[PDB]
Design a protein around this nucleic acid. Structure first.
Ligand SMILES: [Mg+2]
Lengths: 336, 217, 342, 37, 75, 112, 62, 56, 230
RNA sequence: CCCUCGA
């Protein structure tokens, strides 16, 4: 009854079949009819299998099982234990969170085809487009300075040093007077690359395979609009920046519930994605709804969408049967 | 009005420039970009669809005696460039016993399909390592992610793989504007992946574009 | 897609600080796992895209759906319920777009220059379509001052009074405007029959236009206007050339001399302190006065040195985003810092 | 309605059912986080 | 109504012309929703009164009805 | 696949080593055997030492802890040298992200 | 007393309401919110809640 | 490497004023003044500085 | 490889000289690969006739003023630029407009030499007061797109801007509809002159573009994306 | 409920 190693699993796929003793009074009339007709003498049970939770998918990496029949330390009353391990290969997506090292966070708005990206003069499409308006007021031009250095290290440089070493390079650079492409450099905090030395490296940048200097001495470049083809009218700062995939991904966060479990005390929807819960329409939300004068929406939210235990069922029944949504009942939490 | 001509200019075996002139003033950029957007996206190719490895049932594991795990092997198999004329799924095989490198040249392709970079590194085997792989190759275009095992009728052993069909590598252009009879000279620059030649890819882009522009006509 | 059609959904972002923190929308089915949120409602939700999340609620009953469509629809809630002014206004990138689109540049490409000798004036266009064709060649700049014959744009109150009746005008009535092609396009975004606004679109000016529209035009008109403004502002912000680089962060040239001067004053104050003439609180008070003043002078000498088209200056001064003390701490100086005690 | 004036949200004179107390409380509270020392 | 762009989806018919036909937005909510309940009950009790779209929700029909003044109301 | 930053500080390496997810050689030796599964170094002592690789382990937070050998059979390694990379390491240095070609510009409001 | 007890200082309000045999008219909106009745505001007002809708004789003909 | 202000025998969260959360001049070289949470734990969770060591 | 055939082309005619065309559904990205290209071919690549230069007798010394006419010289040029003309001559052609007396001059008020035609004859050009008289020479040539003032020593010859292109304004937008919600939908808004309908403008542009990309296909006719219906 | 994190 355990899913086989290597299976691809989707929402609701059984991972481990399990049944729980039910009791004849809990058989539905259809289940009672079916069990009588076909003479099923098997003990009445309800399906309590472990399924794949909503919006999760992957490959079964490994099964691990402990038994009471075998000598396996288990809690009291616990007979069989099984862990299915599922692996998903998550690609980067709209809604994932990225950030550099300078507090420059964003979510991904759009993943464009390669042909749509602005590209350099040699056809190289840029990888990521960071909006200009976000930089100056957050006081992190480190992200820009890094970008410049990132370009230099990517292209490699060789300072002149003929007829003497220049003035900007005099102070620090020494064996930093040249660097091979995709060089690996360090900017120690409070002792890193000074501004003048940074500007100097932007001049002696090595070219690409065609002898072209693609990034000028300001750190800017001419880009072509990949959508139309016309060049963008002004030199744009381009360079290389370290970007991190932050552990806030759409896959973990998307959630939706039509109907699901309810708390036994209050009869209101459970809470949390993991429990297939419903969103909390809180107090300030009800003020918002009241200020609109949206009375029926507010009632419906507060009776049939959470608390009215007969109106819930009659509303789902109405929607499924194609007729008008009925009138609310009394919230169970008022009786509580 | 002189009719426009297109003249090729080979740079390397997999790179060519293409001079188109004379063109209306202001028109070169758009023409070159239509060609670039077609080349980057719609040039047909072939690539690997799925692979099957002997002792493995899924991606996330190791083969004995090999240095790379199966994920790293598949990543190396992403760099593989291949041609096929069979337009229907066909199988390559890869049997090798260590010690030694497994390169793409060790792949035994069926007639009609060709492995173009035999030097490419696939895996490293030692005394105890034996690699026994099957690689399905199909013909397609664009980039098609791994096809789920429930979309195809695939059984548990099959490892689907992301497929980069596009055989073109890098495309750019520049125009020379003469500005009284003004005109634009367009210079396309196309580099491919040894699966086809710049000329062939550009011919394919031109066929696609002709058949799509015939709509307004 | 069949059932979703025309079935409104409520979007909420917490904290709901006012009723506009819940707004109804028509859902378009989207590819992916994220909610796409129209850029003009951000201000209302105080939503940015650094990881914010939002909640979706589906009204069921005819009454709840009707309350959603009528009472809560985003385009029916353009105005702030606290101040009565609009909120769904172009905010940052849009601003830089329009401010770039409607700025006049002395000496730009294709500028009108009057007839001098045998040469004609070479700046006049029979229609805005002709100016578009000119700008297709490298001949006319979108921001160059020109003269155009306008037909589908109402003239300014003064020009319309002079060349017609006081309210006499029609979509056919042509006239001669000395404007930029950008300002022609901007005014073509505004509703038909709105007096032609020939101005650089600082945020305050756009606020004026939208306040006037909301005062005098129906809601739907303001909504379609601001949608059009959004489109144009984004398209032109892309092409505005506003970027950041270490080069554009110009430093003030006199900064050393200024700071040395105010250090001279501070040294006077401290020599006055050790002499016994100043109380400790009075020493700190005089020092803070000196350094407030030095910071102000550094900020000034900075503003004196930045060309008016630098992307940092442009972004601040268009009203798009930011203020100038940010620019002063970026280039210039941070200044005085507070205590753990304040 | 006439004493209250226009509904700030709509621009027209306030409709007969409006709950202006909640709108007033919200309008006063919303910028409260801007008030510093 | 003159020169205006033709509204799309939910924003049609426009809310100003609809508010011309009723006293307050609240009256219009109840007007349209009660008519919509009538329309949906009809499919299982008069109407619809206008040409229904290919697959149009009954509330959209009711709103178009109210726009064309095809029905009356009291308070 | 992990990729150290082109631009870093001196801190990446020394933070990876001390974090522990990187496999480090206790003693100098020669790599007697290397597989994805483990690494054996023959010390000059004559003794052997074998470091088993964590392969696709699940972290407390659902991220993949996958160690990967960076040595080859026959290689000479000294004590303190990294033998295998961890989850966010590249050749011994902490590699939390990727080097991306960035453009600083508005683009049609999709990065608004 | 329902409105007061749900706002703040619940124990005190409820002790007093008990001593005084207070009877809540249940007329405020919050009270209506608590019990699940349409709030007396906006579309929940009797003026709007009880609208009678029917087609016109002219439109009912055609 | 974290230094946490709450816990048994430490200070309680309802008594976590604003001044225990400030950067204190004696933190220099001991507790990093940058790394701390933005939300409700600000100034209650710091991290040890690079060259710092705890004495007996 | 394998081919998809579904793209179709529909037209909504807004006015007699303005149409919106929709091409859908395009495989994703193609809305922009043939959006800007179709537009610039429509604008700069369709041949048409226009005025290159005018000569107005009676005033050659002081430009931007004319006796007996309430219209400025600049306004006369602005009008004569908006004169829609079609011609068959490969060489420049000359027209002449002369009308006296208080009245209103129009476009048909000019005598079109053989082959050329005046399509907007009811177009106002100037008004003449008492004792008013107009004698003015116009030069018509064939061309493409829009060329600015192209300038000798002939005293009194004013060169003008040549709106050769029969089409006046073109815009385009790319929307999304698919089988997938990301396939491209191209929408072209093309407003032309009275020389040709938007239909003919689009067809001529498609012709020139088919030839242009056939240039590339010619390299080696070979495999590429095909359709079933055209 | 608490802990750590998110806007
Ligand atoms: Mg935020």
């Amino acid at each position: 009854g355990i899913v086989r190693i290597g299976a691809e699993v989707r929402d609701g796929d059984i991972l481990v079949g399990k049944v729980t003793p039910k009791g004849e009074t809990e058989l539905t009339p259809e289940e009672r009819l079916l069990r009588a007709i076909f003479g099923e003498k098997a003990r009445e049970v309800r399906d309590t299998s472990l399924k794949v939770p909503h919006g999760e998918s992957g490959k079964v990496i490994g099964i691990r099982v402990f038994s009471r029949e075998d000598e396996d330390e288990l809690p009291a009353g616990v007979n069989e234990l099984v862990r299915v391990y599922v692996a998903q290969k998550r690609k980067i997506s709209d809604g994932d969170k990225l950030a550099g090292r300078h507090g420059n966070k964003g979510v991904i708005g759009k993943i464009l085809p390669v042909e749509d990206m602005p590209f350099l003069a040699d056809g190289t499409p840029v990888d990521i487009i960071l909006n200009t308006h976000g930089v100056p007021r957050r006081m992190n031009i480190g992200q820009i300075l890094e970008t410049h250095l990132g370009w230099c290290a990517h292209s490699g440089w060789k300072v002149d040093a003929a007829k003497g070493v220049p003035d900007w390079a005099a102070r620090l650079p020494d064996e930093l007077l040249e660097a091979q492409p995709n060089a690996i450099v360090s900017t120690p905090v409070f002792d890193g690359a000074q501004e003048a030395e940074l500007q100097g490296l932007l001049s002696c940048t090595l070219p690409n395979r065609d002898g072209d200097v693609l990034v000028d001495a300001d750190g800017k470049a001419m880009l072509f609009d990949g959508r139309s083809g016309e060049p963008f009218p002004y030199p744009v700062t381009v360079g290389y920046m370290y970007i991190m995939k932050l552990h806030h991904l759409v896959d973990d966060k998307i959630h939706a519930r039509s109907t699901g479990p309810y708390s036994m005390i209050t009869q209101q929807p459970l809470g949390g994605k993991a429990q297939f819960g419903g969103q909390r329409f809180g107090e300030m939300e009800c003020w918002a709804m009241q200020a609109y004068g949206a009375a029926y929406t507010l009632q419906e939210l507060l009776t049939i969408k959470s608390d009215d235990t007969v109106g819930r069922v009659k509303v789902y029944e109405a929607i499924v049967k194609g007729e008008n949504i009925p009138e609310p009942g009394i919230p169970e939490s008022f009786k509580v | 009005s002189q009719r426009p001509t297109l003249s090729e200019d080979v740079l390397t075996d997999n790179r060519s420039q293409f001079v188109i002139e004379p063109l209306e003033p202001g028109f070169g950029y758009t023409l070159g970009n239509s060609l670039r957007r077609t080349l980057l996206s719609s040039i047909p190719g072939a690539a690997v669809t799925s692979i099957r490895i002997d002792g493995v049932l899924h991606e996330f594991t190791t083969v004995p005696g090999v240095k790379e795990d199966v994920t790293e092997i598949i990543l190396n198999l992403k760099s593989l460039v291949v041609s096929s004329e069979e337009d229907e799924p066909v199988t390559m095989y890869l049997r090798k016993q260590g010690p030694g490198e497994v390169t793409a040249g060790d792949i035994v392709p069926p007639a009609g399909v060709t492995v173009h970079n035999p030097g490419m590194h696939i895996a490293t085997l030692n005394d105890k390592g034996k690699l026994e792989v099957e690689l399905v190759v199909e013909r397609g275009r664009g980039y098609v992610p791994a096809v789920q095992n429930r979309a195809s009728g695939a059984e548990i052993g099959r490892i689907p793989v992301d497929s980069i069909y596009s055989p073109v590598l890098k495309v750019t252009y520049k125009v020379d504007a003469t500005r009284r009879t003004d005109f634009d000279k367009l210079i396309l620059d196309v580099e491919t992946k040894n699966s086809i030649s710049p000329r062939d890819a550009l011919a394919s882009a031109g066929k696609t574009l002709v058949e799509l522009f015939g709509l307004a006509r | 897609e069949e059932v979703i059609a025309e079935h409104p959904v409520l979007l909420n972002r917490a904290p709901t600080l006012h009723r506009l923190g819940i707004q109804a929308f028509e859902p378009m089915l989207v590819e992916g796992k994220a909610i796409q949120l129209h850029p003009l409602v951000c201000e209302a939700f105080n939503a940015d895209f650094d990881g914010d999340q939002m909640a979706v609620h589906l009204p069921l009953s005819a009454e709840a759906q009707a309350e959603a469509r009528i009472l809560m629809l985003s385009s029916n809630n353009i105005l702030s319920p606290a101040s009565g002014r609009p909120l769904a206004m172009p905010r940052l990138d849009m601003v830089t777009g329009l401010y770039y689109l409607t700025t006049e540049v002395p000496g730009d490409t294709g500028e009108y220059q009057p007839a001098s000798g045998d040469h004609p004036e070479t700046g006049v266009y029979s229609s805005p379509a002709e100016a578009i064709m000119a700008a297709d060649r490298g001949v006319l700049s979108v921001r160059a001052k020109i003269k155009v014959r306008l037909t589908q744009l109402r003239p300014p109150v003064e020009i319309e009074a002079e060349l017609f009746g006081h309210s006499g005008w029609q979509p056919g009535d042509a006239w001669m405007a000395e404007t930029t092609l950008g300002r022609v396009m901007f005014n073509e975004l505004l509703p038909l029959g709105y007096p032609f606004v020939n101005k650089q679109m600082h945020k305050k000016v756009q606020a004026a236009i939208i306040n006037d529209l909301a005062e005098r035009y129906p809601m739907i008109v303001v909504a379609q206007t601001v949608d059009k403004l959004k489109d144009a502002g984004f398209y032109w912000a892309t092409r505005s050339g506003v970027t950041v680089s270490m080069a554009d962060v110009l430093v003030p040239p006199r900064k050393k001399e200024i700071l040395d001067h105010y250090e001279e004053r501070a040294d006077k104050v401290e020599k006055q302190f050790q002499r016994g003439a100043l109380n400790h609180d009075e020493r700190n008070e005089a020092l803070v006065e000196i350094w407030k003043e030095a910071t102000d002078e550094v900020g000034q000498a900075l503003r004196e040195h930045y060309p008016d088209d630098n992307p940092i200056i442009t972004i601040v001064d268009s009203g798009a985003t930011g203020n100038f003390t940010q620019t002063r701490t970026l280039a210039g100086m941070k200044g005085l810092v507070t205590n753990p005690k304040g | 309605a006439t004493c209250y004036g226009r509904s700030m949200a709509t621009g027209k004179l306030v409709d007969i059912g409006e709950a202006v107390g909640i709108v007033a409380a919200q309008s006063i509270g919303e910028p409260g986080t801007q008030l510093t020392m | 109504s003159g020169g205006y762009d033709t509204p799309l989806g939910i924003t049609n018919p426009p809310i100003d012309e609809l508010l011309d036909r009723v006293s307050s937005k609240y009256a219009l909510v109840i007007y349209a929703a009660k008519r919509a309940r009538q329309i949906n009950d009809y499919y299982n009790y008069v109407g619809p009164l206008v040409e229904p779209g290919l697959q149009e929700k009954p509330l959209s029909i009711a709103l178009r009805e109210i726009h064309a003044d095809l029905l009356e109301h009291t308070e | 696949r992990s990729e150290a930053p082109l631009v870093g500080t001196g801190m990446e390496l020394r933070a990876a080593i001390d974090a522990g997810d990187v496999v480090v050689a206790e003693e100098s030796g020669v790599i007697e055997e290397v597989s994805a599964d483990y690494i054996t170094v023959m010390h000059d002592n004559g003794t052997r030492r074998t470091y088993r690789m964590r392969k696709f382990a699940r972290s407390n937070h659902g991220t993949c802890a996958n160690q990967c050998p960076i040595v080859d059979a026959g290689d000479r390694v000294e004590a303190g040298q990294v033998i295998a990379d961890g989850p966010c390491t590249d050749d011994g240095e902490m590699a939390l992200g990727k080097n991306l070609l960035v453009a600083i510009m508005p683009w049609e409001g999709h990065n608004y | 007393w329902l409105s007061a007890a749900s706002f703040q200082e619940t124990t005190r309000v409820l002790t007093d309401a008990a001593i005084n045999c207070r009877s809540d008219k249940l007329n405020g909106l919050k009270e209506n919110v608590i019990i699940g009745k349409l709030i007396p505001a906006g579309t929940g007002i009797n003026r709007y809640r009880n609208i009678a809708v029917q087609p016109t004789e002219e439109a009912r003909a055609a | 490497r974290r230094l946490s202000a709450l816990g048994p025998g430490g200070l309680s969260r309802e008594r976590a004023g604003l001044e225990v959360r400030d950067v204190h001049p004696s933190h220099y070289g001991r507790m990093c003044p940058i790394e701390t949470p933005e939300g409700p734990n600000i100034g209650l969770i710091g991290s040890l500085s690079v060259y710092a060591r705890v004495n007996p």
